[PDB]
Amino acid sequence: SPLGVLLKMIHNALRFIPVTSVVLLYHRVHPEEVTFHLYLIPSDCSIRKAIDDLEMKFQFVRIHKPPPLTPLYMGCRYTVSGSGSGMLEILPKELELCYRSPGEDQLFSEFYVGHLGSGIRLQVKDKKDETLVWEALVKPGDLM
């Protein structure tokens, strides 16, 4: 027994949910029906151009989106909600930060909207206390 202390919570996990906010909301518009992807994967910045040019090569178009107010963590699970979630088709409503390599492909969340109208409000809360961590809505004036 040499001091089996609790050691608090290191939570060595910050400043990366901003740079995985920018990969969120991948939209594909060949007809006016639009489909969407979401990605949340930590610990590096060389993942960003690989996944960005990946969805560029696989025909998903960019938009700048709000970073989280406080960055999230890995080893833990988060929920995806909002006006477009539930009403329009979100099959992975559960997301989770877990590290995968810069080169390799990722878990997504497929989200169809169809004729989106003028806006789709979306949310990523945490599954711990459902604090409103992340906020957005997409704009057809920024669609391709």
């Binding site: 027994s1 089996g4 609790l6 050691l7 608090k8 060595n12 910050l14 930590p42 833990c76 877990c98």
Partner: protein, 846 residues
């Protein structure tokens, strides 16, 4: 008394308490940094470039999460009066060293549980200076790289070369052979293997293990440190490379010895502990020796092998002592430490007694180890073939009446002057009561033995007489030896650099002294802080990772500089800074250190976290956080913000938090530590109560009617002892992971602080808190037992047996289980629940 003059803590909702813990966590992501460690200085050997050295170390840069191998470039000159902050250059090119969600092997998780190393990535690495080899264990398999040996110093990060294997399972404990850097060694499946990095050639050397069944049926291991050694004697390896190479002289073959530990864990009791996979609902067997039960039957053995010029394992050979180890060395229960002399001549080993009162250092020359075969005629043959002169030399023999703390400091010298009479340095606490370095010269006079017949050695049969024992330090302070501290012996200038508590027990300072003459002890660190230091191998500059109770930890690089004619007065001048002190929280108050005297006029130190927004006059509820047990000092002049942030959270809610270093704690010498000899529990809680009385008198906000005593591991054990023997003072008692029955605990700790069950009977029943359960309170909501279910150290049985005896005595409790956490709460979710449960329990029932 005055219920309008006592502080009532604002009762928050459960979600409120989570909001508070999360707001604490919003900057604990800042305050934890995992400051760099395991430094290796290498010179640039340029004399025309810009950088004088390259410092290699482990670190998490907070551009990434897991810690990684890094380096800094220490320049030849610095623009003075303007401080240089060293960049954290990444040595490797941003790969990850943990699998997804932290999944490890069970042996890796057990070893990390042993060292309590909570951070992820490359845990620790091994380095060889000449080749510039970095052999480390990262992710799935061993890796290596090099930087500036016969090759050069890179500027970009490189790729880590993987070590391929045909073997299954993890490859634990890897080490480079110093005599030949191409060769290395590791433990796999509890047997010693050796490989070669460039050709990929592997070789098993020991066959004490077979992998036939579970560990209940495959009991012999080799080269691995057992449980009690890992968790009480802080030795994590059981094999030591020979640092020099001998030549067998057949044609050109270079022999390479390895000292290893054979372990026969057949008779040691087996306990089942739940696996981390709760779904599988199976256990793991653990060879866990209780007090009085048989410890593993140990022995030392030489594993040699011979290689060609091209680096292929030509021959191999297990070797064993000419007589059995148990017979040549009676009363030897534990091999605390071992290694080799620097010239390679003798292999030393520190033995230790069953009662831990008879430590003795011994040298075992490699010719004492014959080859090991079942053929008793080859065995007799080489018993005649062993020369008469070669002999184990019991060089040093520490004997005490209290207990021997294992001090790993032992620096034997080259003995090129007058080639007998080994001269060494040795930390000796039992002599003066305090750990002080000595230079000891023992004369190695061999008497000549017939190793053919088997005989029983006497009491001090191999004991060499001492030529001289100059004491290099003396006083009422001690030299740090345990907890991975070390000495650094510059033999060129004849100085020895050590760490110590010469100013005060609350700080660790780097001191230097000459071993030629016990002269003047030069402090190198600034006072008013506490320092963890690490020297260069060239003894020209060191690092100090230091902190104070007020300032967070910083990591500064100092440079010994001055006239070379008097190297003892070389002035350490601040050269560059590596890590600066981080931003303290907006709602952090530094705690106040105090001291006081007992009725016996023994000086105890203590901490206090004052209540935030204190209004004078009001009495606040007080959480006596406690550990109290040996080998741990809670109070020292170091930063308490990273490990004891919950204590600040308590203060921020309005609880006075008191911390007292009761008698029996470390850093303060053997006579201080030894007041708990055979009376664990019977003196510490009295000192804690005394501290509370003192802090109550000094500061005016300690409500004696509202006292909580919270503790963990050994500390919880005291919280339960507090609620039993001092029930009127402690309102509640949050006992986390308590040791409730001493008779169930392991040998290494208990057989030392107390004795064998037949010897100290009243000490076991008085100290086993679960057998005094009738004296626990009749009132409810006064006792909260916390326990990690998968515990390997303080097993769940202890809480289970406590709850059993509470049931039988009809006493209430509360209980919280952490089904995934082993001994330290490691998962952040479980730690957040633990703290909100602690705040809620105090809020409602204190």
């Amino acid at each position: 008394d005055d219920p309008a003059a006592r502080f009532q803590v604002q009762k928050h909702s459960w979600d409120g308490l989570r909001s508070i813990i999360h707001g604490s966590r919003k900057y604990s992501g800042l305050i934890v940094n995992k400051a760099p460690h395991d430094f290796q200085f290498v010179q640039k050997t340029d004399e025309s470039g810009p950088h004088s050295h390259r410092l290699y170390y482990l670190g998490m840069p907070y551009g990434s999460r897991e810690n990684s191998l890094l380096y800094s470039e220490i320049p030849k000159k610095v623009r003075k009066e303007a401080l240089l902050l060293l960049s954290w250059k990444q040595m490797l090119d941003h790969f990850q060293a943990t699998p997804h969600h932290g999944v490890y092997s069970r042996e890796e998780e057990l070893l990390r549980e042993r060292k309590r190393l909570g951070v992820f990535g490359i845990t620790s690495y091994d380095f060889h200076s000449e080749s510039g080899l970095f052999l480390f264990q990262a992710s799935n398999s061993l890796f290596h790289c090099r930087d500036g040996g016969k090759n050069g110093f890179m500027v970009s990060p490189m790729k880590p070369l993987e070590i391929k294997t045909q073997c299954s399972g993890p490859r634990m404990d890897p080490k480079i052979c110093p005599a030949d850097p191409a060769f290395f060694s590791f433990i796999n499946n509890s047997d010693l293997w050796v490989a070669n990095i460039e050709t990929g050639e592997e070789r098993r050397l020991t066959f004490c293990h077979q992998g036939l069944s579970n560990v209940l049926d495959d009991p012999k291991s080799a080269g691995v440190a057992t449980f009690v050694i890992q968790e009480e004697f802080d030795r994590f390896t059981g094999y030591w490379w020979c640092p020099t190479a001998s030549w067998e002289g057949s044609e050109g073959l270079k022999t390479l010895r390895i000292l290893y530990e054979e372990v026969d864990e057949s008779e040691v009791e087996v306990i089942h502990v739940p696996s981390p996979a709760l779904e599988e609902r199976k256990t793991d067997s653990y060879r866990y020796p209780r007090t009085g039960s048989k410890n593993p039957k140990i022995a030392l053995k030489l594993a040699e092998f011979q290689t060609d010029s091209q680096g292929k394992i030509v021959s191999t050979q297990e070797k064993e002592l000419v007589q059995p180890f148990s017979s040549l060395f009676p009363k030897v229960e534990y091999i605390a430490r071992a290694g080799w002399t620097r010239d390679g001549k003798y292999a030393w080993a520190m033995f230790l007694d069953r009662p831990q009162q008879w430590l003795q250092l011994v040298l075992l020359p490699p010719a004492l180890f014959i080859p090991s075969t079942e053929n008793e005629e080859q065995r007799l043959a080489s018993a005649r073939a062993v020369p008469r002169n070669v002999q184990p030399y019991v060089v040093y023999e520490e004997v005490t009446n209290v207990w021997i703390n294992v001090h790993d400091i032992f620096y034997p010298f080259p003995q090129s002057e007058g080639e007998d009479e080994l001269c060494f340095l040795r930390a000796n606490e039992c002599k003066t009561g305090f750990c002080h370095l000595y230079k000891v010269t023992a004369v190695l006079k061999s008497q000549g033995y017939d190793w053919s017949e088997p005989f029983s050695p006497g009491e001090d049969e191999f004991k060499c007489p001492i030529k001289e024992e100059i004491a290099l330090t003396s006083g009422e302070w001690e030299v740090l030896a345990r907890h991975g501290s070390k000495i650094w012996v510059n033999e060129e200038t004849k100085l020895v650099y050590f760490q110590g508590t010469k100013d005060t027990p609350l700080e660790h300072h780097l001191y230097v002294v000459s071993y030629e003459a016990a002269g003047e002890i030069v402090r190198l660190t600034t006072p008013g802080f506490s320092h963890s230091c690490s020297m260069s191998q060239n003894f020209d500059m060191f690092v100090s990772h230091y902190s104070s109770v007020s300032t967070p930890p910083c990591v500064h690089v100092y440079k010994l500089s001055g006239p070379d004619d008097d190297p003892l007065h070389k002035q350490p001048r601040f050269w560059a800074s590596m890590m600066e002190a981080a931003s303290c929280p907006p709602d952090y108050v530094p705690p106040e250190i105090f001291h006081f005297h007992t009725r016996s006029d023994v000086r105890l130190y203590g901490m206090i976290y004052k209540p935030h927004a204190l209004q004078p006059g009001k009495k606040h509820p007080t959480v006596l956080f406690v550990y109290g047990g040996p080998q741990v000092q809670l109070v020292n002049n170091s930063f308490k913000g990273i490990k004891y942030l919950r204590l600040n959270t308590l203060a921020s809610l309005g609880y006075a938090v008191v911390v007292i270093d009761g008698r029996g704690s470390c850093q303060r010498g053997l006579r201080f530590e030894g007041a708990l000899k055979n009376q664990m529990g019977q003196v510490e809680i009295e000192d804690q109560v005394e501290g509370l009385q003192f802090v109550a008198e000094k500061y005016g906000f300690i409500d004696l009617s509202r006292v909580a005593i919270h503790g963990w591991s050994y500390g919880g054990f005291l919280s339960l002892m507090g609620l039993i023997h001092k029930p009127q003072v402690f309102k509640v008692a949050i006992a986390g992971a308590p040791v409730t029955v001493w008779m169930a605990y392991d040998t290494g700790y208990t057989e030392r602080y107390m004795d064998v069950p037949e010897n100290n009977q009243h000490g076991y029943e008085a100290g086993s808190v679960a057998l005094h359960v009738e004296k626990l309170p009749n009132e409810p909501n006064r006792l909260l037992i916390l326990h990690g279910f998968l515990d390997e150290n303080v097993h769940f049985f202890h809480t289970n047996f406590l709850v059993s005896q509470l049931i039988r005595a009809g006493k209430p409790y509360q209980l919280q289980i952490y089904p995934n956490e082993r001994h330290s709460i490691r998962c952040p979710e479980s730690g957040e629940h633990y703290e909100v449960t602690l705040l809620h329990f105090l809020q409602e029932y204190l």
